[PDB]
Structures are given as C-alpha cells and as structure tokens.
Design a protein around this ligand. Structure first.
Ligand SMILES: CC(=O)N[C@H]1[C@@H](OP(=O)(O)OP(=O)(O)OC[C@H]2O[C@@H](n3ccc(=O)[nH]c3=O)[C@H](O)[C@@H]2O)O[C@H](CO)[C@@H](O)[C@@H]1O
Ligand SMILES: CC(=O)N[C@H]1[C@@H](OP(=O)(O)OP(=O)(O)OC[C@H]2O[C@@H](n3ccc(=O)[nH]c3=O)[C@H](O)[C@@H]2O)O[C@H](CO)[C@@H](O)[C@@H]1O
Ligand SMILES: CC(=O)N[C@H]1[C@@H](OP(=O)(O)OP(=O)(O)OC[C@H]2O[C@@H](n3ccc(=O)[nH]c3=O)[C@H](O)[C@@H]2O)O[C@H](CO)[C@@H](O)[C@@H]1O
Ligand SMILES: [Co+2]
Ligand SMILES: [Co+2]
Ligand SMILES: [Co+2]
Ligand SMILES: [Co+2]
Ligand SMILES: [Mg+2]
Ligand SMILES: [Mg+2]
Ligand SMILES: [Mg+2]
Ligand SMILES: [Mg+2]
Lengths: 475, 475, 475
C-alpha cells in the first residue's frame, strides 16, 4: 500500500516566469502532467499534489488530469514555501492520522521520471526494509543538486545542498534525485525534528537522511544509471536541455518502429504523435499535439503541424497547419497554411501560397496556387485556378460558398459568398462571381482586351521600352 | 590480385522497412552505392555483390552502378539468409574453383568505409602473411557489434556476437568492423567447418577467426582509430547517426575550401554538391543531388535545392527549388518555389510568393511578387507586375506564351496561353490578355472606376466605417 | 599602466577568403570588433592594432570602432607578415621609446576573449612579478596550437608550434592561448634575439618564452579553465565551432533571464539583441543585428529578423523581416516578408503571403492574405481584402498612396499610386482604383457577371466536366 506526494508548491523563481514553474511544457505536456501520468501508471492507493500560492491556477489542471487518468488526486495546500520538508508535512496532512502505507515523495520538476523507476524504488525499499530509500545518480555537472555524503564503507550518511556544501563537497558528482520512499512513522518522526538553520533558512526534506541515520534507522541509496530519468528542472536552461533529451528518445522510438527521421536534432515530436511505417520526416519539422501521420508519407522540411491527421502516402512539405485533416495520397505545400477546420480529401492538392480555413475540399480537387479558401465546401475532382479568393467576409459579415464536382474555375476568380457553383461549371479568368452558376455554365465578367498601338512611344518616350518597340519595328 | 565480396543479402528486419536496407540513403546515395563507389576506387580484379530475396529490386541498381563506375560487378545469389558465413560461401561461388587472389569481405551496411581503409587492410594482410586480417575499432557504445576476444598477450582469439556474449564480454569495447581480408584456401577451409549452434542459429562469418586460430593459422587484427569509417547500420537510429557524421565531414570539407557555413548542424550537403569560394550558407539549408553553387553567393536560411545550378554572386533565400538554373547575380526569395525546367538569367529576380515551372526568364527580368509563371518564355529586362498568372491550362489543355524584352506588365494581369507580348509592350493593371500584343502597344481590359457616394451610410448604417465617414465629413 | 597590442596583420590564408580574416563575423560582430570591445572595457592607457596588407580595408573599421567605444586606437603597420614576434615589434613602434607600462599582446582571431580574463592576466602578472605571463588552457583537440613544454617540477620552459613539435610533443594537450602580459624591457630584449630558423621560417612570438627562461627571468603560465574564452580561429571550421559556442552562451543568458528558447541549437541570437520576459522562441529562428523583442511574445518557428523592433504580446511566426517595427499585440505570419521601413501598429495583422515595404500601417489594421503593400500609409482599424496590390511603380516611376481609417477594401483591388482612399470607404472585389475615393464612398470597376448556359457541353464535349453537368441535370 503506497501514497505518492508530488511537491509542486515552491515559488519557481529561477524560471523568471509569470507562468507557474510546473506548468512549463516539453513535448506537448506540462512538467506536472508528465509527473502525474507517470505516477498514475504505477497506480498507488493515494496520490496527493502539494500546491502553494497560485494553487487556484494549478488545482483545476490537476482535477482535469484526475478525470483523464480515471482516479482521484488530492490537493494539499502549503501556504508559504518553507521548504521541501515542510511541503511533505503539508502533503501528509491529506492522509489519515493512522495511515500505514509507504510514502513516496517526488518533485513536480522531475518530468522524465517514469513508472518503472518508481516501481523499482518501491520494490527496493520493501526488500531492504529501509526507513528511507533515496534515488541517486551520478552527473558530470552536479551544480544545484544535493550531494550524496558516504562514510568510508560507502554508507549513506547525509545529503548536503549546493548552497550548504563546501567547495570540496561540491566536487561530489553523486547527487540526490529528490525521489524517495519512506516508512511513514519514521518520516513523521524525522520531519518533527527539522530545523531551518542552513544557508536557505528552509526546512529541507534532505535533512531527514542524516536524522534517520542518527536514530540508527536503515538508510538505502538506489543509484539510477540513466540520469535523465531523474534530472531536475529549476530554470529554462535545464528545461530546454531535458526537452531536447526527451525529444531524442521520442524520435528514436519512431525510428526503431520504422520511421525515417533524417535529422533527429531538428525534428520535434510531441509524446502523443503517431507516425506510420516508412514515413520520411525531413529536417526542421515539428509534429505537435495529437498529430497522426500515416504510412509512406513525406513530411517536411520546415513543416509545423499541430493536431493534424494525415493519411497514408501523403506529402506535406513546408506547411504550417493546425486542427486539419489531409487525405491519403494528397499533396500539400511547399508554403501552404492550413487553419483549423480544413479537410482535404484523398489525392487532393493544396499548393504554394495557398491558405485554407474552415473548408472541406473533396477527393482529387486541386487548389494549386496563390489562393485563399475560407468557409467553403468544394466537391470532387475540381480545379481552382491560380490567384483566386473565396470572399467570406463583406466588411461586417461572413458567409458559405459551395462549389460542385468536376468544376474548373479560371485564374483570378473572386467567389463573393454565399454562391453556389454547379457541377462541371467553368469560370473565365478574371471573373467576379456574385451569383449562382448552373451546372455546366461558363460564368464571366472581365471586359474585352483592347490593344492601344504605339502607346509606349507616346507616353514613355525615350524609355528602354520605347527604344525596344522601335528596335523590334525595324529588324 | 584481390576479389571483394559485398554481403547485401540479409533481410534487414531491424530497419522495419519495405525498402531493402542497402537501398536506404544518406547524403544523396544509397548505402550500397557508397560501398560500391569506395570499392571501385580501390579497383580490385573482381567485385561480387551477394544478394538475397528481392534481388530483383537491387540487381538492376548494381548494373547501373557498374556502368557508371566503368567495371563489371557480379551478383551472387543467396537464396535464404542463413548467415554471414553462408553469404560469403555464396559469394565465392562467383569465383573460379582455382581462384588464388586474396578475398576481401565487407557488408553493404558499412557505408562510410573508404578506399584508403581497404587499401591499408590489404597492405597489412600481405605484410604479416595473415590467413585472416580483421578490421576492428573501439567504441563507447559497442551494442550489437561482435566483440574482439584477446588472450593475455593480446593475441586475437575469437569474435563473439552481441547475442552470444556474456554480460561480462558485452563490456568489451573493441569491436569487429566486419571488414576482412583472407587467404582464400584458408577461408574455404574454415567456412566448411562452420556450424549454426549459436544464439541466432546462423552460420556466422565471425566464427572463422576462432576456427583459423585452431589451426594455428595467422590471425591479425588491424585497429581503425577513426571508428566512423567502419560503423555499421542495422536500424534507422544508426542510419541517421552516421548520416549526421558524414554530413559534418562534407560540410567541413567545404569550410576548409572556402565556404562559410554558419550552422553545420542544420546545413545538409549531398556528396556530389559543389560550392564556390566565399559563398555563405545560412541555417536550415539542404543542398541535394547535383546542386552546384558558384562563388560569393548567399544561400538560405531555410532553402532546399535539388539539382539546381546557381551562378556566382546570386542570392537564393527561403527558396524551395529543383532541376532549375539561377544565373550570376540573380536574386531568388524569400518564399519562392522553383519547379523543374526553371531557368532564370543573370541579374534576374524571382521574389516572394512567386512560383515558376518550365519557364525561361531572360537576363535582368524581374518577377517580384505573388505570381505564377508556367510554361512561358520571357525576354530580357522585363518586369512582370505583382499578382499575375501565366495561365497555361484551359481546363483540359496546356499551352506556351512568349513575352519580349523591356516589357512592363501591370499588376493582376492574366496571360491566357498561348499569347505573344511584343518587345517594350505594357499591360494595364487588371488586364486579361487573351490575344497578341504588338511591340510598344498598351493592352487593357479593366473597366473604369466609378465612385458611389455615401454608399457606406446607406448600406452599412451605424457600422464603424459609417461613423468614420460621418466623422471625416464634419472636422 | 598598460598598453594592449592586437595582432591582426597575418595573411589569414587558411580562411580561403577574399575577406580579411579578422573581418569574418559571429553573433553580429567581426572577430576584430569582438576583440576591441573586450579590450575597450578593460580600458588600457594605450590600444594598438597591428595591420598588414589590406590595412586600407581594415583601418577605417578600426577608427569607426574607436569613435563607438569613445577612445583612441592606434594602428601600427607590418609591411610583410614575418611572424607574430615581428608583428609585436611593429606594434611597439607605436609606443614612446621610453614606455614603461606593461605590454599585453593578443591576436585578432581569439574573439571570445573577455575583459575579466585580461584583467586576471594583468593582475597575475603584477602579483608574481613576471617578465612574461602566458595564458594557457587544456584541450581534447590541441591541433594547430603551440604546445606548453614544462620541466619535471612543472616549470614552463618553452612553447613549441604545431609545425615544429615532435609526434610525441604533439600529444601535449596544454596549449598556448597566444595572450600574454610582458615587462616591456624584457620583451624588447627577447624580440631582438628571435631568429626564424624553424619550420615556418617565421619570427615566432612564442620563442620569447624560452629566451626569457634562458636569461633566468620569471616566466609564469596562467591556466584558463574555460577554454572557449581563449580558443583561436584559423579556418572556417573553427570559426563556426566558436560561433556555435558563443551562441549557446547568448541563448543561455536569455533563458536565465526569463526567455523560453525551445531549441537553443537552432535559435541564433546576435549579441546586441534584447528579448523580454516570458517570450517564447520556436525552433529555426535567427534574431540578428539590433532586433528587440518585448515581453510575452511568440517568435518563430522559422523566423529571421534583422534590426526589427517587436512590442509586447506580439506573434511573429515564419516571418522574414528587416528594419521594421511590429506593435504591441500585433500578429505577423506565417509566411510574411517585411522589407525595410515597415511599421505595423499595435494589434495590427500582416498574414500569409503578404509582403510590406516602406509602409506605415495603423493600429488594429489587418492585411490578412496574398497582398503586397509598397510605399503606402494606411490608417487605423482598416481591412485590406485578400490578393490586393499597392502599385507604387508605373514602369518608370514610384509614388505614395494613403488609405484612411475604418476602410474595408475588397479582394483583388489594385491601388494605382498615388491615390487617396477616405475614411470608412469601401472598394468592390476586383476593383482597379486609379482615382481618389471619398470618405464613405464605394469604389467599383468590375463588370457584371454573365452566365453562359451549357457552354461546357458545347465547348468541352465528353470532358469529365460535361459528363458531370449532364449527370447533375438528370438526378
Ligand atoms: C532541500 C531539497 O529538497 N533539495 C533537493 C531539491 O533541490 P531543488 O533546489 O531543485 O528544490 P526545488 O526548489 O526545485 O524544490 C523541489 C520541489 O519541491 C517543491 N517545493 C519546494 C519548496 C517548498 O517550500 N514547497 C514545495 O512544494 C518545488 O515546487 C519543487 O517541485 O531537488 C533536487 C533534485 O531535483 C535535489 O538534488 C535536492 O537535494
Ligand atoms: C555474424 C556476423 O557477421 N556479425 C557481424 C555483423 O553483425 P550484424 O548484426 O550487423 O550483421 P548483419 O545482419 O547486418 O549482416 C552483415 C551483412 O551481411 C549481409 N547478410 C547477412 C546475413 C545473411 O544471411 N546474408 C547476408 O548477405 C547483410 O545484408 C549485411 O550487409 O556486422 C557487424 C559490423 O557491422 C560485426 O560487428 C558483427 O561481428
Ligand atoms: C608563433 C605563434 O605566435 N603561435 C601562436 C598563434 O598560432 P596561429 O597559428 O593561430 O597564429 P596566427 O597565424 O593565427 O597569428 C596570430 C595572430 O597574429 C597575427 N599575425 C600573424 C603573423 C604576422 O606576421 N603578423 C601578424 O600580425 C594574425 O593576424 C593573428 O591574429 O596563436 C595560437 C593561439 O590561437 C597559439 O597556440 C600559437 O602558439
Ligand atoms: Co528543483
Ligand atoms: Co549490420
Ligand atoms: Co483581378
Ligand atoms: Co590564429
Ligand atoms: Mg529556492
Ligand atoms: Mg539478423
Ligand atoms: Mg488578382
Ligand atoms: Mg600561417
């Protein structure tokens, strides 16, 4: 039986942010969401999140996550950030007085911590009958971590904080993860003995190690070799470092599953994204939120998609797109903008300098060039001519437009919504369509061409164009 | 006298691909092409590629490469992938029974192997009179490689595979490259003694080392310090790692030759690309296939060019382009798409939101804005006005259009192919050109402007525009 | 009292450039500017730059920097590049014969050298009463650096150049920074004893170490642990390596100050750029020259801005822009090009496939799609319809256009400069505006739509459009 406490009530001042630290994101989830997902998978009997100033801004997000993960998550409040040891005291207050399960503690700023690591911790703690088991790792750069102090026979004696450590203790590269398992009576007893006479004037959870050792209680350190899983994030430098590591792991998982990622270093993939076999992702690409890409696609370079579904065999190149679907075999890009509600059918095409918003575009239909399609429904196997605009907006209002199948509209056509263009209709180049066009009708509005002979000689006399028409006249 | 065998008949299952492993690419060539280029330069008397299931999909590519490299390359078939030792047996079958040259063996998945490394191997093998000389290297991460086992006086005893090695042998960081030279009689004798009682149930080439040592035959290991040259690719993670290393080497060669590459990490350059002195390449750029860039150019950021020739002093910025030429001093981008058959003359300009396909554009001509130029020939020193379209396609058909020199066409002109615009002609803004325009003529079609006074007060009563025309009326 | 000499008169042949080596840039400044900024902050009594062939191309840049930094900087000429020791001789020639201050020497190709490092050097030199104090560091790859030779009790004996060192001395990883402090009499005495019998046939400054040791003079080495601060740049590979390191440091400083930089590896920030709290920078972004970004902005991905000011809460996404201002809360991108002189007001919008040049755009005004705005002034809360062009240029000439506030212009409107559009006016879709439009007028020019019934059956008989109008006719 285990209760897990997540300490998320510190001020987060080193982030230098007006957004609460635990709400900063990597790979499409906040640090707090990563931590609560990992813990939820372990499925402890109790899950308590300690929150501080704000709490009004974080507790709702906690309750949404409890619903998503299908379990209750209690919030305990810590009124002032008196230190990690005091935050654990506040967390214990959400437990019955008589609670007898183990207590696991972790921080809200260790976002790569996983279920397996927690399960190993609990298993080790139970096996050695420890009063306290602390996860540790070894780092090239241990700055800012609590240093593990061992006796000559390698017994863990104490954890010393960066601010409290001597220059010589600072050289210690074995560090405290800040993930612990405790015997609850031993934890309560040690917490009642903390004092705050240290460099930060705080009540440090870390002092419990030395306090329990004082009592001749069993103190066990469990070394996590994969240091990233317990790396902490106190500032934005560490956040981006850990985001980069998580992203390499996500990309690698896709590569081992059959996805070619040309340049993992410049390919950002959020945790919920799925990608089919033999897709190729080119450099400079981000796949974000719940994007799903099918098999044998080509995506990128320089593509950003958030919540976009892409079928099999599609090409989505130099495209910026959100909340849209792209059908099997469709071709999007280069230089294409998809705004929410865009649905392009199979074997559709949206080409360069095209923007679509809130429009459905049927199977095999092509909008190849320099056009804006807004609030419109277009049928199958139609062709929209270059440099056209679906005019939704009359200065105050916005309306719908329907274009049928096998239509061929001429370049530079403006469709002033709402209008209906019937199946197989055409429009001339340069048409302003303000009324319905029957099936198989040709709609036109451009006036006839008139040539004004020798205009250039008269109105641009002695210009390079005048000399040129003169020169062409002679030869 | 030497025969080289390339083993390329394994299933490649760890790639999780429907494309044969040896056909996956880096820096513009398949792994197999890289390996056969390296070997061809060494110029052995015989070159035999062992192929498996598929072979129908790979052998043609081999024959194309034989023609390109100007030499014969024999294919030997291995019907089932019974292991590397069996693949060598199959390869030997393409040699005469009485063959007496050395036999060199390498894999199709070691794509950075170079001619010099092979020549050193053969030279070392001949010098020590070895029965077998095996290339080895030392790696931080030796996962998946055969481990080199040495006696106490550092004699090579055996190679143990990742799957067959003990936890303690797995700690060995000296690894088998899988590149060997053999005395042929000794190779044939050892291969006849292989058995498949191991963790993979395969006939391992690697066992020949221990078998030859058994016979008191000379076994020599030659350590390659530059580990990348013998790194292998069994999955897409390793493929992208080795692609990134190869790319750093290609970029570095350009930098040492006089090319500024601002960010090598985000600048991908294929092996056949050439780049002139004092060109600057900005981040996020890929130069692919047979692209050639001249001297003093500026390329990028965010440019992708495949088979594009760019002259000296040109700027090609945020451009996506293929099978096109860009003249000396020309300016392309930002946000410009070049499709195949685009030829832009010296001091030409193709600006933002411009797409060109299959068009020739003469010296000094500018197409600066929001325009599509398809299937058209344009002369010298002409100016195409913003937001124009060369309409090639009439719904069923596509035709040509010719525009002369020193022409100035007005914004929003549509050129309905085929039409000819003579030298020094002009078009008005908003013209639809459906007929020829003589030299120095002005072609027009837009109707006259009419102002409807107080329309906004009548039809948008109490709108912010109505209040504003009211307010401007008073003051 | 101290005089600093910067040696910048070598040929720079390893750069393979027609641009003088010390003029190559990183993070928005030349190597020479970085070095003179660092030295200027230290504020020595004398600052002398030794220049060579060229000097005509570099000395003006030196004088501009002297004015900027508010101090004199003397140029000494070295006619031929006879070596670093000869360049110091030439530099001393700009000092009085009787000069008694310390002499500090550094190269023009050590561009991360900082004021603190120089101040520590001078402080150490004075403390130990050294004749010569040389800065050293230790490197994994010491190729091309002078190697530090020490006796058995760790006394510095000599510096040996890469070209002159034995294979075994080349293994030495402690290297000469080429930054020194000297007692001036001891320096002059040692320089008069240099000879050029070495591998480069040059007069090496580095020999002064052994010469002074000969005289039993005090020689002190001061180890700089942060090796980047004294890394040198002899070729473009080293230049990009040091640019990447400097850039990581600049980015890190922003992150610690409150800026989220999602991907430091692909975010290039020049030294003079400022960025406000809680701004987020997305991958693939360069912020260059004197760009200033306010707080809570979103910038990128794939954005390049040079000398662009962006207010607070603005979004500037996939934008390529220079010498422009973007107001508070404004939205720019994706796929937007800003040319110099663009000023967008607060809560303005410039959307996809929009280019602006030399135009002012007032508070709350939107230019959302496919439009070019050149040489124009637009008022507040106006809306420019999609696919429009401000036509500045009549084939020979360019003029102004003024658009008032609360105007709503129709899609596909061409504004033939110069024209004035009054407050609250409208234009129809497809209008060519060649004359002034009063406040609250509606300007139009497009002809009426005509539908030609059954045109497709007659002129595209048996086409998929004809069959479709037939099929829609029946059902
Ligand atoms: C004294 C202590 O515990 N130090 C550990 C803490 O350091 P570190 O300095 O990182 O501690 P933080 O300030 O980040 O606090 C840890 C967590 O506790 C929460 N919090 C903090 C103070 C408070 O009064 N209330 C509260 O709830 C924070 O929100 C954070 O999630 O984590 C590091 C691992 O990442 C360990 O190496 C350190 O040994
Ligand atoms: C048993 C063996 O040789 N192991 C070596 C092989 O491991 P590794 O596990 O990489 O071996 P692969 O499966 O990649 O086989 C090597 C090559 O032989 C070909 N192939 C394989 C099986 C077959 O029946 N037919 C065939 O032609 C494959 O196509 C590939 O090109 O290369 C590594 C270096 O990269 C070495 O460290 C290993 O010691
Ligand atoms: C002989 C010498 O000094 N070697 C040092 C020099 O090597 P390194 O080979 O880098 O020397 P450079 O050729 O780069 O010369 C150093 C500087 O002196 C200037 N210059 C050079 C030659 C000349 O005749 N006139 C002149 O003014 C160059 O412009 C450059 O700024 O710097 C390295 C650190 O970066 C040190 O490890 C080397 O020990
Ligand atoms: Co922390
Ligand atoms: Co392999
Ligand atoms: Co028009
Ligand atoms: Co140098
Ligand atoms: Mg704190
Ligand atoms: Mg296998
Ligand atoms: Mg138009
Ligand atoms: Mg030199």
């Amino acid at each position: 039986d285990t209760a897990v406490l997540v300490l998320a009530a510190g001020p987060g001042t080193r982030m230098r942010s007006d957004t609460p630290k635990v709400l900063h994101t990597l790979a499409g989830r906040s640090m707090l969401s990563h931590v609560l997902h990992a813990i939820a998978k372990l499925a402890p009997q109790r899950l308590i999140v300690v929150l501080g100033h704000d709490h009004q801004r974080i507790a709702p997000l906690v309750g949404e996550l409890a619903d998503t993960l299908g379990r209750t998550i209690d919030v305990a409040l810590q009124d002032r950030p008196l230190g990690t040891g005091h935050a654990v005291l506040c967390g214990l207050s959400a437990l019955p007085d008589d609670y007898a399960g183990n207590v696991v503690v972790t921080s809200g700023d260790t976002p790569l911590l996983d279920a397996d690591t927690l399960a190993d911790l609990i298993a080790t703690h139970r096996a050695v009958s420890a009063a306290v088991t602390v996860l540790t790792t070894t780092l090239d750069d241990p700055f800012g971590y609590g240093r593990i102090l061992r006796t000559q026979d390698h017994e863990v004696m104490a954890i010393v904080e960066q601010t409290d450590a001597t220059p010589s203790q600072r050289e210690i590269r074995e560090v405290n993860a800040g993930v612990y398992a405790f015997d609850i009576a031993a934890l309560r007893s040690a917490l009642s003995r903390l004092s705050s006479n240290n460099a930060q004037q705080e009540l440090y959870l870390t002092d419990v190690i030395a306090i329990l050792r004082s009592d001749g209680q069993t103190v066990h350190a469990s070394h996590v070799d994969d240091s990233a899983l317990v790396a902490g994030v106190n500032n934005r430098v560490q956040l981006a470092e850990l985001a980069s590591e998580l992203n390499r792991r996500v990309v690698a998982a896709h590569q081992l599953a059959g996805v070619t990622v040309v340049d993992p270093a410049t390919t950002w993939i959020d945790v919920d994204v799925t990608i089919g076999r033999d897709t190729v992702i080119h450099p400079g690409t981000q796949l974000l939120g719940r994007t799903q890409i099918g098999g044998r696609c080509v995506v990128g370079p320089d593509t950003t998609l958030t919540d976009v579904a892409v079928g099999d065999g599609a090409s989505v190149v130099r495209t910026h797109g959100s909340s849209s679907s792209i059908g099997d075999g469709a071709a999007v890009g280069p230089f294409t903008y998809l705004r929410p509600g865009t649905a392009l059918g199979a074997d559709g095409k949206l080409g360069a300098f095209v923007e679509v918003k809130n429009s459905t575009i049927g199977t095999g239909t092509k909008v190849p060039h320099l056009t804006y399609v807004g609030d419109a429904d277009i049928g199958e196997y139609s062709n929209i001519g270059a440099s056209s605009v679906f005019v939704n907006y009359d200065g105050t209002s916005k309306r719908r437009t329907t274009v049928g199948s096998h239509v061929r509209t001429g370049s530079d056509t403006m469709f002033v919504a709402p209008v209906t263009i019937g199946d197989g209709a055409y429009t001339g180049a340069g048409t302003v369509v303000r009324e319905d066009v029957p099936p198989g009708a040709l709609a036109v509005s451009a006036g006839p061409q008139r040539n004004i002979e020798n205009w250039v000689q008269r109105k641009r006399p002695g210009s390079p164009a005048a000399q040129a028409s003169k020169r062409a006249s002679e030869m």
